[PDB]
Scaffold this active site. Sequence first.
Site, PDB file in Angstrom:
ATOM      1  N   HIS A 396       0.824  -1.208   0.000  1.00 45.80           N
ATOM      2  CA  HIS A 396       0.000   0.000   0.000  1.00 45.80           C
ATOM      3  C   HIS A 396       0.862   1.263   0.000  1.00 45.80           C
ATOM      4  O   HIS A 396       0.635   2.179  -0.793  1.00 45.80           O
ATOM      5  CB  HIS A 396      -0.936  -0.018   1.213  1.00 45.80           C
ATOM      6  CG  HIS A 396      -1.699   1.254   1.431  1.00 45.80           C
ATOM      7  ND1 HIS A 396      -3.043   1.369   1.143  1.00 45.80           N
ATOM      8  CD2 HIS A 396      -1.322   2.446   1.949  1.00 45.80           C
ATOM      9  CE1 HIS A 396      -3.455   2.586   1.458  1.00 45.80           C
ATOM     10  NE2 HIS A 396      -2.431   3.259   1.950  1.00 45.80           N
ATOM     11  N   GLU A 397       1.850   1.310   0.890  1.00 47.42           N
ATOM     12  CA  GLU A 397       2.754   2.456   0.960  1.00 47.42           C
ATOM     13  C   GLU A 397       3.545   2.607  -0.340  1.00 47.42           C
ATOM     14  O   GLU A 397       3.853   3.720  -0.761  1.00 47.42           O
ATOM     15  CB  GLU A 397       3.719   2.329   2.144  1.00 47.42           C
ATOM     16  CG  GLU A 397       3.076   1.943   3.474  1.00 47.42           C
ATOM     17  CD  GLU A 397       1.970   2.890   3.908  1.00 47.42           C
ATOM     18  OE1 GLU A 397       1.067   2.444   4.646  1.00 47.42           O
ATOM     19  OE2 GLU A 397       1.999   4.077   3.523  1.00 47.42           O
ATOM     20  N   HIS A 400       1.736   4.600  -2.861  1.00 50.74           N
ATOM     21  CA  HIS A 400       1.957   6.036  -2.719  1.00 50.74           C
ATOM     22  C   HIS A 400       3.226   6.480  -3.444  1.00 50.74           C
ATOM     23  O   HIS A 400       3.258   7.551  -4.045  1.00 50.74           O
ATOM     24  CB  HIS A 400       2.049   6.432  -1.244  1.00 50.74           C
ATOM     25  CG  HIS A 400       0.744   6.372  -0.512  1.00 50.74           C
ATOM     26  ND1 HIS A 400      -0.406   6.963  -0.987  1.00 50.74           N
ATOM     27  CD2 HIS A 400       0.415   5.811   0.677  1.00 50.74           C
ATOM     28  CE1 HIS A 400      -1.391   6.759  -0.130  1.00 50.74           C
ATOM     29  NE2 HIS A 400      -0.920   6.062   0.889  1.00 50.74           N
ATOM     30  N   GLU A 445      -5.222   7.856  -1.127  1.00 49.12           N
ATOM     31  CA  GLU A 445      -5.543   6.638  -0.397  1.00 49.12           C
ATOM     32  C   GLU A 445      -6.320   5.659  -1.272  1.00 49.12           C
ATOM     33  O   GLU A 445      -6.135   4.447  -1.172  1.00 49.12           O
ATOM     34  CB  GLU A 445      -6.346   6.961   0.869  1.00 49.12           C
ATOM     35  CG  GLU A 445      -5.524   7.471   2.061  1.00 49.12           C
ATOM     36  CD  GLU A 445      -4.142   6.842   2.176  1.00 49.12           C
ATOM     37  OE1 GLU A 445      -4.014   5.604   2.041  1.00 49.12           O
ATOM     38  OE2 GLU A 445      -3.180   7.595   2.421  1.00 49.12           O
TER      39      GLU A 445
HETATM   40  C1  LIG Z   1      -5.308  -0.631   4.827  1.00 48.71           C
HETATM   41  C2  LIG Z   1      -4.002   0.018   5.203  1.00 48.71           C
HETATM   42  C3  LIG Z   1      -3.931   0.848   6.314  1.00 48.71           C
HETATM   43  C4  LIG Z   1      -2.726   1.449   6.661  1.00 48.71           C
HETATM   44  S1  LIG Z   1      -2.662   2.408   7.938  1.00 48.71           S
HETATM   45  O1  LIG Z   1      -3.514   1.894   8.976  1.00 48.71           O
HETATM   46  O2  LIG Z   1      -1.313   2.477   8.430  1.00 48.71           O
HETATM   47  N1  LIG Z   1      -3.119   3.792   7.464  1.00 48.71           N
HETATM   48  C5  LIG Z   1      -4.508   4.105   7.131  1.00 48.71           C
HETATM   49  C6  LIG Z   1      -5.493   4.066   8.278  1.00 48.71           C
HETATM   50  C7  LIG Z   1      -5.164   4.510   9.552  1.00 48.71           C
HETATM   51  C8  LIG Z   1      -6.132   4.442  10.547  1.00 48.71           C
HETATM   52  C9  LIG Z   1      -7.396   3.943  10.248  1.00 48.71           C
HETATM   53  N2  LIG Z   1      -7.687   3.526   9.010  1.00 48.71           N
HETATM   54  C10 LIG Z   1      -6.774   3.581   8.034  1.00 48.71           C
HETATM   55  C11 LIG Z   1      -2.178   4.889   7.218  1.00 48.71           C
HETATM   56  C12 LIG Z   1      -2.710   6.214   7.749  1.00 48.71           C
HETATM   57  C13 LIG Z   1      -1.846   5.047   5.755  1.00 48.71           C
HETATM   58  O3  LIG Z   1      -2.675   5.455   4.957  1.00 48.71           O
HETATM   59  N3  LIG Z   1      -0.612   4.726   5.378  1.00 48.71           N
HETATM   60  O4  LIG Z   1      -0.120   5.217   4.172  1.00 48.71           O
HETATM   61  C14 LIG Z   1      -1.588   1.212   5.898  1.00 48.71           C
HETATM   62  C15 LIG Z   1      -1.663   0.382   4.784  1.00 48.71           C
HETATM   63  C16 LIG Z   1      -2.872  -0.215   4.442  1.00 48.71           C
HETATM   64  F1  LIG Z   1      -2.949  -1.023   3.370  1.00 48.71           F
HETATM   65 ZN   LIG Z   2      -1.993   5.488   2.766  1.00 49.98          ZN
END
Ligand SMILES: Cc1cc(S(=O)(=O)N(Cc2cccnc2)[C@H](C)C(=O)NO)ccc1F
Ligand SMILES: [Zn+2]
Length: 486
Positions: A396-397, A400, A445
């Site tokens: 996911h990161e 970005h 996101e």
């Molecule tokens: C689903 C998923 C989630 C995360 S996260 O929880 O750390 N997150 C997202 C998040 C945090 C709290 C509640 N809801 C979602 C952070 C902020 C983020 O976007 N990182 O770029 C990171 C990667 C993921 F795939």
């Molecule tokens: Zn994110």
Amino acid sequence: RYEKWEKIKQHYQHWSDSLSEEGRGLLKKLQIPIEPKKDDIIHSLSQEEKELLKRIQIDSSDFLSTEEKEFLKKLQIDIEKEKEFLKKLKLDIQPYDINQRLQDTGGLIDSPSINLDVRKQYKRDIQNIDALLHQSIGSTLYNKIYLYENMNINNLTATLGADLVDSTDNTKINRGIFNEFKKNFKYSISSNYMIVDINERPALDNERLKWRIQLSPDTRAGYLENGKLILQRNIGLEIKDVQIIKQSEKEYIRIDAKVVPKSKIDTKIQEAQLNINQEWNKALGLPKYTKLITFNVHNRYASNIVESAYLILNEWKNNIQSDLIKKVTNYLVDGNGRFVFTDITLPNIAEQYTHQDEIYEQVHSKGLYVPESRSILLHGPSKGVELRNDSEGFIHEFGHAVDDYAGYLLDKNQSDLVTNSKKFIDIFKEEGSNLTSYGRTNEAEFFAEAFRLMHSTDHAERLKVQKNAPKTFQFINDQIKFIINS
Ligand SMILES: Cc1cc(S(=O)(=O)N(Cc2cccnc2)[C@H](C)C(=O)NO)ccc1F
Ligand SMILES: [Zn+2]
């Protein structure tokens, strides 16, 4: 149970008697953190802020811990768009908690992740406590006693913690999950003051870990009465044994650990950092002097943070096409970007707070990407909301980062995210709610979530992106094509 209290107490008799009124008050502060009282938070509020606060639905909030939610509810009892308000207010409801500050920062207490005034008070208190804890347990008692600490598994790994207890019988430990927790647990760091007992005590609610610790002769400590000790901060622990035991027809996890110099542990981490970099510079064809992977490790599940980094990057390499990975990573490296694996909270990571002065904009989570430092941050202990494992988080990161590079490619001068283009904005407005609930948050996101699901091991998830968000699916493939042809 009580036969060893007296001799430990007598060992620290003079130390206890010579304690100043302030030294004692400090030890009480450390044991009992100071909560914010409701009436002062409320009277600090203006009557436009008050009226705002009570009309706010609060459990809905994505970035507030359950304790922070409950607290503000009680404020509503006494009295989106403005997440603006809850982010600023989040800072002013934190308890004054010395041990938590040390853990959150890993001892890097100068990290600008809390207000200046309290930040400086924390420093003064910590330095005063360090001066108090000057008397070591010594050669007459170090090998004659054990120190015990009960611990919640969520403190070490909230991901494994979700399934540690057998769902078919809560008196049992999930043997499979147990093996995962034990597999790479070789050493441990305490960056705060461990509060331990001379004798073993019954575990409280959802505490399934029961540490048994032997101190070294030189380990400094103070007696806190009632058969309780407080240890000096910055001590290393070597894990000697991890076993499932049974007390009162309920299963627990015994962790036998031995105190060692923290520098000994830090050496292993530094050696591991050199190894993972030399190994991954070769795999990615990066220059041999590249420093890409960084270990910021300071807490009690230390060895697993290091070991899991290897596996996370392996899954990453296995699930994303090689040429995309190489192009994007070389972009990150061109801006001195890092892959940071850590067990301290993300606002205390330099790759974030350097480019984020506003504390209320600072973010703690499982994972993060910071375009200004071109870095991916991955927090070990925590558990991502609606996220299977750490590998999926990292992917996911990396979404970005793909977003960053793709936007960079279409205008290197005025560098921006490709998700900030009108083209993807329109796509997000159309398909933004067709994937994960959190994907709805914004363009970036939604992009990163879509990218994650498109690279999930579950092939069904990949098909669900193409079917439910075909324009987003198409757009992402176009960015990938754009990138590898650059
Ligand atoms: C689903 C998923 C989630 C995360 S996260 O929880 O750390 N997150 C997202 C998040 C945090 C709290 C509640 N809801 C979602 C952070 C902020 C983020 O976007 N990182 O770029 C990171 C990667 C993921 F795939
Ligand atoms: Zn994110």
